[PDB]
Design a protein around this ligand. Structure first.
Ligand SMILES: [Cl-]
Length: 243
């Protein structure tokens, strides 16, 4: 149960995409989004389920930053994996080119992308229509207080989180990245998919209530050790590891 502070997490990302290492946001985001999709597929296998059961959708809520981007990637892989993903993308930064491209990729795969209005997103918070919800609102760079419409979105999610499973990307939206859940109501994810390395707030989950996965398989030993942790033992060619 090793974790990295939000401060070091920012330093890691900065170094990974720095001139020395040379990683591009496109690569990391693609790999990260892939991880999340793989966790969803592993947690909610389609084998066995009836056609009616398979008709349910995977409701992906994308935030305006990096976390949301990871969600846009996740949605495309889920479509390829055989699921029926639906994306709710309320606030889009019209200055980040890659996010726009990720949306075009979703259109290419015929994955619905709802707006903050026209999409009546609330219809997807009903048990008979949604298999699980992917929480890709805010990542480790989150800093309270939370503003609308994300505040209200989290409220709506908390009302049905005990009936519909929520899969949180990197960290549970609304939680203090280092201190843990503070504000109430608070997200209680059925699954948490930490990216690169889990943050301090991850030690606040309950194993009986939340399954924990770590994703983002692109960290060498010496680099990890430099930041206080050991690279995770991903099995086979998996892009996720349980715990
Ligand atoms: Cl973010």
């Amino acid at each position: 149960l090793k974790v990295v502070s939000s401060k070091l997490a920012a330093e890691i990302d900065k170094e990974l995409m720095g001139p020395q290492i040379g990683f591009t946001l496109q690569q990391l985001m693609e790999l990260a989004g892939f991880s999340v999709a793989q966790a969803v597929c592993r947690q909610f296998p389609l084998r066995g389920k009836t056609e009616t059961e398979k008709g349910k959708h995977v409701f992906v809520i994308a935030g305006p930053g990096n976390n949301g981007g990871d969600g846009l990637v996740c949605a495309r892989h889920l479509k390829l994996f055989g699921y029926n993903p639906v994306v709710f993308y309320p606030k889009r930064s019209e200055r980040t080119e890659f996010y726009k491209q990720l949306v075009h990729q979703l259109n290419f795969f015929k994955v619905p992308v709802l707006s903050q209005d026209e999409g009546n997103w609330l219809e997807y918070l009903k048990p008979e229509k949604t298999l699980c919800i992917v929480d890709a609102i805010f990542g480790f760079s989150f800093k309270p207080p939370m503003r609308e419409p994300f505040k209200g979105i989290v409220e709506e999610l908390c009302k049905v989180q005990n009936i519909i499973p929520i899969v949180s990307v990197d960290v549970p939206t609304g939680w203090d990245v280092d201190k843990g859940p503070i504000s109430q109501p608070s997200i209680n994810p059925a699954v948490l998919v930490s990216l690169t390395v889990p943050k301090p707030c991850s030690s606040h989950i309950r194993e009986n209530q939340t399954t924990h996965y770590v994703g983002g398989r692109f960290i060498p030993r010496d680099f990890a050790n430099k930041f206080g942790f050991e690279p995770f033992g991903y099995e086979s060619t998996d892009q996720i590891l349980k715990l």
